[PDB]
Design a protein around this ligand. Sequence first.
Ligand SMILES: CCCC[C@@H](CN[C@@H](CCCC)C(=O)N[C@@H](CCC(N)=O)C(=O)N[C@@H](CCCNC(N)=[NH2+])C(N)=O)NC(=O)[C@@H](NC(=O)[C@@H](NC(C)=O)[C@@H](C)O)[C@@H](C)CC
Lengths: 99, 99
Amino acid sequence: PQITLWKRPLVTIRIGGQLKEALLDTGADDTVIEELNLPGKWKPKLIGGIGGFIKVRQYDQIPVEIAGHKAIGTVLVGPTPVNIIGRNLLTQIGATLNF
Amino acid sequence: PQITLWKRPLVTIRIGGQLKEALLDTGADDTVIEELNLPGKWKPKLIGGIGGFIKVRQYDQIPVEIAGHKAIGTVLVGPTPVNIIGRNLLTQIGATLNF
Ligand SMILES: CCCC[C@@H](CN[C@@H](CCCC)C(=O)N[C@@H](CCC(N)=O)C(=O)N[C@@H](CCCNC(N)=[NH2+])C(N)=O)NC(=O)[C@@H](NC(=O)[C@@H](NC(C)=O)[C@@H](C)O)[C@@H](C)CC
Protein backbone atom coordinates (compact mmCIF):
# COMPACT_ATOMS: atom_id res chain seq x y z
CA PRO A 1 0.00 0.00 0.00
CA GLN A 2 0.91 3.70 -0.02
CA ILE A 3 0.88 5.27 3.47
CA THR A 4 0.91 8.98 4.13
CA LEU A 5 2.28 10.46 7.34
CA TRP A 6 -0.40 12.75 8.79
CA LYS A 7 -1.04 10.04 11.36
CA ARG A 8 1.42 7.55 12.86
CA PRO A 9 1.95 4.70 10.37
CA LEU A 10 0.50 1.98 12.59
CA VAL A 11 -0.41 -1.35 11.09
CA THR A 12 -1.52 -4.78 12.32
CA ILE A 13 1.07 -7.50 12.43
CA ARG A 14 0.92 -11.25 13.13
CA ILE A 15 3.70 -12.61 15.38
CA GLY A 16 3.75 -15.86 17.31
CA GLY A 17 0.15 -16.51 16.26
CA GLN A 18 -1.04 -13.27 17.86
CA LEU A 19 -2.17 -9.96 16.36
CA LYS A 20 -0.37 -6.79 17.48
CA GLU A 21 -0.21 -3.17 16.37
CA ALA A 22 3.13 -1.74 15.34
CA LEU A 23 4.64 1.44 13.97
CA LEU A 24 6.48 1.34 10.63
CA ASP A 25 9.71 3.10 11.63
CA THR A 26 12.31 4.03 9.02
CA GLY A 27 14.36 5.52 11.87
CA ALA A 28 14.78 2.14 13.56
CA ASP A 29 17.52 -0.26 12.56
CA ASP A 30 15.77 -3.13 14.28
CA THR A 31 12.28 -4.35 15.20
CA VAL A 32 11.35 -3.93 18.86
CA ILE A 33 8.18 -5.38 20.40
CA GLU A 34 6.74 -4.91 23.90
CA GLU A 35 7.47 -7.54 26.53
CA LEU A 36 6.01 -10.92 25.56
CA ASN A 37 7.05 -14.46 25.01
CA LEU A 38 8.22 -15.74 21.74
CA PRO A 39 9.08 -19.29 20.83
CA GLY A 40 12.67 -20.28 20.96
CA LYS A 41 15.81 -19.03 22.45
CA TRP A 42 17.06 -15.58 22.94
CA LYS A 43 20.11 -13.72 24.12
CA PRO A 44 20.43 -10.43 26.00
CA LYS A 45 21.19 -7.29 23.97
CA LEU A 46 21.07 -3.54 24.51
CA ILE A 47 19.69 -0.96 22.12
CA GLY A 48 19.41 2.80 22.16
CA GLY A 49 16.87 5.44 21.31
CA ILE A 50 16.19 9.13 21.88
CA GLY A 51 16.32 8.77 25.65
CA GLY A 52 19.21 6.31 26.05
CA PHE A 53 19.64 2.55 26.23
CA ILE A 54 17.45 -0.38 27.26
CA LYS A 55 17.91 -4.08 27.74
CA VAL A 56 16.07 -6.40 25.34
CA ARG A 57 15.77 -10.06 24.45
CA GLN A 58 17.07 -10.86 21.00
CA TYR A 59 15.14 -13.54 19.10
CA ASP A 60 16.40 -14.59 15.69
CA GLN A 61 14.54 -15.81 12.65
CA ILE A 62 11.06 -14.97 13.80
CA PRO A 63 8.26 -14.92 11.22
CA VAL A 64 6.29 -11.68 11.25
CA GLU A 65 3.40 -10.79 8.87
CA ILE A 66 3.24 -7.04 8.34
CA ALA A 67 0.03 -5.71 6.73
CA GLY A 68 -0.17 -8.97 4.77
CA HIS A 69 3.53 -9.14 3.78
CA LYS A 70 5.83 -11.85 5.16
CA ALA A 71 9.17 -11.28 6.85
CA ILE A 72 11.41 -13.59 8.86
CA GLY A 73 14.14 -12.01 10.93
CA THR A 74 15.36 -10.68 14.25
CA VAL A 75 12.85 -9.41 16.76
CA LEU A 76 13.94 -7.62 19.93
CA VAL A 77 11.58 -7.82 22.90
CA GLY A 78 11.66 -5.35 25.79
CA PRO A 79 10.28 -2.21 27.37
CA THR A 80 9.73 -0.12 24.26
CA PRO A 81 6.97 2.49 24.52
CA VAL A 82 5.58 1.34 21.16
CA ASN A 83 5.95 -1.72 18.97
CA ILE A 84 8.16 -0.78 16.03
CA ILE A 85 8.97 -2.44 12.73
CA GLY A 86 12.48 -1.41 11.79
CA ARG A 87 14.57 -1.58 8.68
CA ASN A 88 15.62 -5.18 9.13
CA LEU A 89 12.01 -6.20 8.33
CA LEU A 90 10.95 -3.18 6.26
CA THR A 91 13.58 -4.13 3.69
CA GLN A 92 12.22 -7.68 3.51
CA ILE A 93 8.70 -6.47 2.63
CA GLY A 94 10.05 -4.03 0.02
CA ALA A 95 9.27 -0.79 1.78
CA THR A 96 10.63 2.47 0.48
CA LEU A 97 10.26 6.13 1.25
CA ASN A 98 9.08 8.27 -1.65
CA PHE A 99 8.71 12.00 -2.15
CA PRO B 1 12.89 10.35 -5.32
CA GLN B 2 12.87 6.91 -3.82
CA ILE B 3 14.89 5.97 -0.78
CA THR B 4 15.46 2.30 0.05
CA LEU B 5 16.03 1.13 3.58
CA TRP B 6 19.10 -1.08 3.29
CA LYS B 7 20.99 1.66 5.12
CA ARG B 8 19.79 4.39 7.47
CA PRO B 9 17.84 6.99 5.42
CA LEU B 10 20.25 9.85 6.00
CA VAL B 11 19.79 12.85 3.76
CA THR B 12 21.08 16.38 3.53
CA ILE B 13 18.99 19.12 5.13
CA ARG B 14 19.43 22.88 5.40
CA ILE B 15 18.59 24.66 8.63
CA GLY B 16 19.85 28.13 9.58
CA GLY B 17 21.46 28.24 6.06
CA GLN B 18 23.68 25.37 6.80
CA LEU B 19 23.82 21.84 5.65
CA LYS B 20 23.48 18.85 8.01
CA GLU B 21 22.73 15.15 7.68
CA ALA B 22 19.46 13.93 9.15
CA LEU B 23 17.50 10.70 9.44
CA LEU B 24 14.05 10.45 7.83
CA ASP B 25 12.10 8.89 10.67
CA THR B 26 8.49 7.86 10.11
CA GLY B 27 8.47 6.77 13.77
CA ALA B 28 9.02 10.36 14.97
CA ASP B 29 6.15 12.75 15.45
CA ASP B 30 8.51 15.72 15.67
CA THR B 31 11.85 16.91 14.27
CA VAL B 32 14.88 16.82 16.62
CA ILE B 33 18.12 18.51 15.61
CA GLU B 34 21.31 18.91 17.56
CA GLU B 35 21.95 22.58 16.86
CA LEU B 36 22.25 24.30 20.19
CA ASN B 37 23.30 27.75 18.84
CA LEU B 38 20.16 28.76 16.86
CA PRO B 39 19.00 32.35 17.52
CA GLY B 40 15.36 32.70 18.33
CA LYS B 41 12.82 32.37 21.06
CA TRP B 42 12.20 28.85 22.34
CA LYS B 43 10.31 27.06 25.03
CA PRO B 44 11.21 23.98 27.07
CA LYS B 45 9.74 20.63 26.16
CA LEU B 46 10.35 16.98 26.99
CA ILE B 47 10.32 14.26 24.34
CA GLY B 48 10.57 10.54 24.73
CA GLY B 49 11.23 7.29 23.04
CA ILE B 50 13.27 4.18 23.70
CA GLY B 51 15.30 4.92 26.83
CA GLY B 52 13.01 7.58 28.26
CA PHE B 53 12.85 11.34 27.94
CA ILE B 54 15.20 14.18 27.21
CA LYS B 55 14.85 17.93 27.55
CA VAL B 56 14.71 19.93 24.32
CA ARG B 57 14.19 23.49 23.18
CA GLN B 58 11.13 24.05 20.97
CA TYR B 59 11.59 26.56 18.15
CA ASP B 60 8.65 27.47 15.91
CA GLN B 61 8.40 28.38 12.21
CA ILE B 62 11.95 27.38 11.33
CA PRO B 63 12.64 26.77 7.63
CA VAL B 64 14.13 23.29 6.95
CA GLU B 65 14.95 22.21 3.40
CA ILE B 66 15.09 18.40 2.97
CA ALA B 67 16.75 17.06 -0.17
CA GLY B 68 15.88 20.35 -1.90
CA HIS B 69 12.23 20.28 -0.75
CA LYS B 70 11.31 23.25 1.46
CA ALA B 71 9.51 22.87 4.73
CA ILE B 72 8.84 25.16 7.67
CA GLY B 73 7.75 24.24 11.15
CA THR B 74 8.65 23.30 14.68
CA VAL B 75 12.17 22.10 15.40
CA LEU B 76 13.21 20.61 18.73
CA VAL B 77 16.88 21.10 19.72
CA GLY B 78 18.63 18.85 22.17
CA PRO B 79 21.27 16.19 22.68
CA THR B 80 20.66 13.49 20.07
CA PRO B 81 23.11 11.15 18.35
CA VAL B 82 21.41 11.77 15.05
CA ASN B 83 19.34 14.61 13.65
CA ILE B 84 15.78 13.36 13.10
CA ILE B 85 13.26 14.55 10.50
CA GLY B 86 9.82 13.59 11.78
CA ARG B 87 6.32 13.54 10.45
CA ASN B 88 5.68 17.23 11.07
CA LEU B 89 8.09 17.99 8.19
CA LEU B 90 7.84 14.72 6.21
CA THR B 91 4.22 15.52 5.50
CA GLN B 92 5.21 18.92 4.09
CA ILE B 93 7.47 17.35 1.47
CA GLY B 94 4.91 14.79 0.38
CA ALA B 95 6.69 11.75 1.74
CA THR B 96 4.99 8.38 1.80
CA LEU B 97 5.84 4.80 2.70
CA ASN B 98 5.30 2.33 -0.12
CA PHE B 99 5.35 -1.46 -0.32
C1 LIG C 1 9.79 3.88 20.38
C2 LIG C 1 9.15 5.24 20.09
C3 LIG C 1 8.73 5.46 18.66
C4 LIG C 1 9.83 5.27 17.66
C5 LIG C 1 10.98 6.26 17.79
C6 LIG C 1 12.07 6.08 16.72
N1 LIG C 1 13.11 6.99 16.73
C7 LIG C 1 14.44 6.51 16.36
C8 LIG C 1 15.45 7.62 16.31
C9 LIG C 1 16.92 7.33 16.09
C10 LIG C 1 17.87 7.43 17.20
C11 LIG C 1 17.87 8.60 18.14
C12 LIG C 1 14.90 5.36 17.26
O1 LIG C 1 14.75 5.25 18.48
N2 LIG C 1 15.58 4.45 16.62
C13 LIG C 1 16.13 3.26 17.36
C14 LIG C 1 15.17 2.10 17.57
C15 LIG C 1 15.76 0.84 18.21
C16 LIG C 1 16.46 -0.09 17.25
N3 LIG C 1 17.40 -0.87 17.76
O2 LIG C 1 16.15 -0.06 16.06
C17 LIG C 1 17.43 2.91 16.65
O3 LIG C 1 17.58 2.72 15.41
N4 LIG C 1 18.37 2.61 17.46
C18 LIG C 1 19.74 2.26 16.98
C19 LIG C 1 20.64 3.43 17.42
C20 LIG C 1 20.36 4.72 16.70
C21 LIG C 1 21.13 5.88 17.27
N5 LIG C 1 22.03 6.49 16.29
C22 LIG C 1 23.36 6.40 16.27
N6 LIG C 1 24.11 5.72 17.14
N7 LIG C 1 24.03 7.03 15.30
C23 LIG C 1 20.15 0.98 17.65
N8 LIG C 1 20.72 -0.01 16.87
O4 LIG C 1 20.07 0.73 18.87
N9 LIG C 1 10.49 7.65 17.91
C24 LIG C 1 10.91 8.49 18.80
O5 LIG C 1 11.86 8.13 19.53
C25 LIG C 1 10.26 9.85 18.87
N10 LIG C 1 9.08 9.83 19.76
C26 LIG C 1 7.85 10.03 19.36
O6 LIG C 1 7.71 10.26 18.16
C27 LIG C 1 6.72 9.98 20.39
N11 LIG C 1 7.10 9.55 21.70
C28 LIG C 1 6.79 8.30 22.22
C29 LIG C 1 7.10 8.00 23.63
O7 LIG C 1 6.18 7.42 21.39
C30 LIG C 1 6.05 11.36 20.47
C31 LIG C 1 4.79 11.27 21.33
O8 LIG C 1 7.01 12.26 21.05
C32 LIG C 1 11.24 10.96 19.25
C33 LIG C 1 12.32 11.09 18.20
C34 LIG C 1 10.61 12.31 19.53
C35 LIG C 1 9.83 12.93 18.39
